[PDB]
Amino acid sequence: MEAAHSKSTEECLAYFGVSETTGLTPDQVKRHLEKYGHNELPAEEGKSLWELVIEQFEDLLVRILLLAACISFVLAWFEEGEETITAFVEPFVILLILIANAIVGVWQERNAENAIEALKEYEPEMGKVYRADRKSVQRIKARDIVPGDIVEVAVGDKVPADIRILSIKSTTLRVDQSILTGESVSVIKHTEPVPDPRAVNQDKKNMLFSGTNIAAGKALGIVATTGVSTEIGKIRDQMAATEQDKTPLQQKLDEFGEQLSKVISLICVAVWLINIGHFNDPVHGGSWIRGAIYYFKIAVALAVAAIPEGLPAVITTCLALGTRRMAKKNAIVRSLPSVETLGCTSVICSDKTGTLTTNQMSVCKMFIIDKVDGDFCSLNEFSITGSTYAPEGEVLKNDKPIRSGQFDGLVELATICALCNDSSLDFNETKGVYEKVGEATETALTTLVEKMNVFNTEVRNLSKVERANACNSVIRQLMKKEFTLEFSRDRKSMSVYCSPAKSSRAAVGNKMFVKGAPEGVIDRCNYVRVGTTRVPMTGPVKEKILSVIKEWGTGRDTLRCLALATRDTPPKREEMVLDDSSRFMEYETDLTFVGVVGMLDPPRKEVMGSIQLCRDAGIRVIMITGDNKGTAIAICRRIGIFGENEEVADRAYTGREFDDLPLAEQREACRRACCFARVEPSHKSKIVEYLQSYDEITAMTGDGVNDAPALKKAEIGIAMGSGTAVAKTASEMVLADDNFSTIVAAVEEGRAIYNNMKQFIRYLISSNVGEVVCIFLTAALGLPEALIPVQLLWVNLVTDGLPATALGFNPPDLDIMDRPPRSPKEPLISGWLFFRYMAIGGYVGAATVGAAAWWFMYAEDGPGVTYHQLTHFMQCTEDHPHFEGLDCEIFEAPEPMTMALSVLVTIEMCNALNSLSENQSLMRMPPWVNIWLLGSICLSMSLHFLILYVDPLPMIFKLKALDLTQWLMVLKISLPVIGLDEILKFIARNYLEG
Ligand SMILES: Nc1ncnc2c1ncn2[C@@H]1O[C@H](COP(=O)(O)OP(=O)(O)CP(=O)(O)O)[C@@H](O)[C@H]1O
Ligand SMILES: [Ca+2]
Ligand SMILES: [Ca+2]
Ligand SMILES: [Ca+2]
Ligand SMILES: [K+]
User: Fold this and answer.
1) Burial of 295 by CB count in 10 Å (0-12 exposed, 13-18 middle, 19+ buried)?
2) Pocket flag, ligand 1, residue 627 (CB < 6 Å)
3) In whole angstroms, what is the distance from residue 75 CA to residue 92 CA?
4) 354 lines ligand 1 (CB under 6 A)
5) DSSP state of 356
6) Does 591 share its domain with 559?
């Protein structure tokens, strides 16, 4: 722990007693680990509080029923009902259905968080450190980083710990500190001490803070603090209310829930108004307001039934369920609305290098100039064995292993690859594998130098650790790297200014070693090196070099190519200003061509299959890369974006070609082109921007810092697990698996969510409407009451609870990935879907009423009398109108209220079976595709059988179970409602794109 950023670079090194270039010894690391602990915060085991998870009572709908149960609890405490126990069942029934959905909701939120945190720990954060047991930089777990050791940081790296800057290898260092200071744009760092000890974080310009990202440059530093002493560690739980808001779909349903409230409220008030006639009816005797209290109970109870109380929980469930499914496929969701938005995605933008490709780079081909004689130019081509970063391979010429030192051109080629390089190799002992340190492109050159061994260095007797950078270290001991002009994606090249290491025997020449994009580098070459000789760049020589480059990139291997050049006579250092990066290209002119390297970069296996699935799902895929167009087009053909011979004359554009187009043509090009090569980070963001101008949901996939602007711009940013931290920071999803196939699954899963949310709405509306229609159909036709305040709360608990919620666990539709992406601005309920809600709601209302009437009109146990209660409901006892009223008490009979109560339950469990798919029949999608639903149906049916035969309960819910013959009628009328929907589903199936 060093608490001072005011100390100099020497004082920091002296404090921990560590050598700047060597790092902490193994014994030092041991002590510092005991004294300062592991560089790990606990992560806080209390991610959530059990009860805090339980608070699912925030939604308006839960609050309504919450209050609704209260009024029935107040109406049960004092008067307002004679038999109190039955009135004490009312609020407990309402509480019962809420807790059921609450348990379900709490459960899924619990499973999600657990699965999320488990997936987050799969890949241990690694850091680059110099330590005494190794000459080259090595990679260790970030938690094993202790205060005092030398840590190396590069572009795209997450800063592993609080670090005092010792040396900036680049000409500048920019850092993204938004996670700590809120500074939107990157800030510049230096090495000079900031004298003030109490200085705020924004002024610590000689410090790197853990959790921040290196925007540009490369630096060497020493850890000041780790663990909880780290600046970002103190503030993680320090401030609250920084959490996420509700998703677009969730906001869409919130709107929907309130509109339902206004309708149901109107209806409930309307139910109260239409029944102000039975004000003074003998049921409550002669009552001026007591008669209203009962119908106020009816209105309130009808609300609770009609209100989709399960809706708030089923959204959170479907979301948490989707996340958990994604978690199983090693996909990390950093932003909740990522899955629902991806479901309605029409265009997927994807980076090529590292994203569409495995980023396991290995130079397998390279050439230098052989002979130059007029219009004649011949090249010395070479092949390199080894597809890994391992320093094991051969340099083949004419299918013969050769010594690269034999060719002077290869000597300088290897020199450039070694010096003009900000990467290295580190052997990981754990299951022994050579790992890259930095960018894969540069490491492929590092392993090349090792394979070439141009100075015949004895490497046989070296360990696998030393061997990783054996030949590279030899070259570095021959030329002192003064400074480095960093790789810039505008000039697309990189150079290093070097002087002879001896500096005593040799002072003959300073050199600039340049590598970069072939086209750019070659253009800035005026000379061509032939061994140790140098000749002027001409037409024929230029054409020869370029044509071979075109061959490799278009070939069956599709080689990523780099040109390597040298400035024989560079400007004196005084004439060079390292301040502006725009003048670096000027410094990299009058170069001497040395050679061209060719890299193998295999596409990921699952990409080709995934693209076809995207094409079938109406999702378009565009490749966006800074690489050569020839190789980009060739890869596009290799992965299926383009056919093998599509001849895509107007479907592929370079950054130059794209800019030469007017704004209108650029915007239109993004519609037709599926391949953008040689483009800058700004182009990637602009392409996504154009696609969104057509009101499209655009997704972006990348791994580098050149994808960062486009990742933040797109609807959904998806990062690679092996990618940079800058890209992950700018993303909504992270694929730790590096599995591109998960994206297609993520799209599919999000559409199941929407469709399941649809079927949930389709079930509850079309069923609860039928409940409402029933109440209206009886009160208007002048029939006895079908239901009672208690009975109303029962058909709610049974039909609007778990059988409703279980629809959230519905399987994806059969043609879910054969239909086009849903437009984001589609109406939640289509104009025609609303007709189903009535067509089903109409029959349910007519089924529940016909049941209570059939007891009155055709039941043998009942009176069995013909039409319409002998035309009126007036009768009650003898001596009223003598219209053959042989029957005495055939009114206020509890058996038909049953009959309605039982049809209502049965017909909704019946209706729920239609909510397995939007338009697919029960034939193609049988009931056993959802076991969770059938269990809820059985539970609801069993709960209804229980409430009817357990003798004290019939007294409460008023039910003499006319068991055999009448349940048949209940089952009989409830059955066509699934038959009708089956016919109703067949219509829209065939009506719209049959
Ligand atoms: N370290 C490096 N030094 C010099 N040139 C480099 C380099 N890394 C890449 N280049 C070259 O610069 C070109 C443009 O760089 P850029 O980073 O924008 O594209 P890219 O192909 O490497 C990333 P992607 O394909 O993921 O978008 C590359 O095509 C490559 O030829
Ligand atoms: Ca309800
Ligand atoms: Ca990349
Ligand atoms: Ca219902
Ligand atoms: K974004």
Assistant:
1) buried
2) yes
3) 13
4) yes
5) I
6) yes
Give, in order, the Cα–Cα distances in Å from 708 to each of 488, 624, 719.
15, 13, 10
Q: Degrees (nearest 5) of the Cα angle 425, 427, 429?
A: 165
Q: What is the CATH number of the domain that holds 837?
A: 1.20.1110.10
Q: How many whole angstroms from 720 Cα to the centroid of ligand 3? A: 9
946 and 824 in a single domain? The answer is yes
Half-sphere exposure of 1 (CA within 13 A, CB side): 11
Q: Is 691 near ligand 1, meaning CB less than 6 Å away? A: no
Q: Looking at 568, 602, 636, which one is the last position of a domain? A: 602
Indicate the number of domains in the chain: 4
Tell me if 532 is assigned to a ligand binding site: no
**How many CA atoms does the CB half-sphere of 479 hold within 13 Å?**
23
Please work out whether the CB of residue 423 comes within 6 Å of at least one atom of ligand 1. Answer: no
**Is 625 annotated among the ligand-binding residues?**
yes
Domain check: are 649 and 791 in the same one? no
Same domain, 23 and 60: no
Q: Which residues line ion ligand 2, judged by CB < 5 Å?
A: 307, 309, 796, 800
How was it solved?
A: X-ray
Q: Of the candidates 671, 675, 609, 612, which has an alpha carbon nearest to the alpha carbon of residue 351? A: 675
CA of 703 to the centre of ligand 3 (A): 5
Give the residue numbers spanning the domain of 515: 359-602
CA of 908 to the centre of ligand 4 (A): 6
CATH code of residue 721: 3.40.50.1000
Question: In whole angstroms, how far apart are CA 169 and each of 151, 323, 482, 484, 485?
Answer: 13, 42, 9, 7, 10
Nearest CA to ligand 1 atom 18: 626
Instruction: Find out whether 768 is annotated in a ligand binding site.
Output: yes
Which ligand is closest to the CA of 560, given by its number?
1
Q: Answer for the pair 362, 389: CB distance below 8 angstroms, yes or no.
A: yes
Nearest to 63 by CA among 260, 309, 405: 309
Rounded-to-integer distance, Cα 402 and Cα 814, Å: 59
Identify whether residues 237 and 312 lie together within a single domain: no
Please tell me whether 458 is known to bind a ligand: no
- Quick check: helix, strand or coil at residue 141? strand
Same domain, 325 and 391: no
- Kindly state whether residues 694 and 753 are assigned to the same domain: no
| Ligand 4 mean position, distance from CA 771 (Å) | 7
142 and 181 housed in the same domain: yes
* Residue 879 is among the residues annotated as catalytic for this protein: no
User: Out of 144, 162, 351, 707, which one is annotated catalytic?
Assistant: 351
Cα–Cα dist 690/671, whole Å: 9
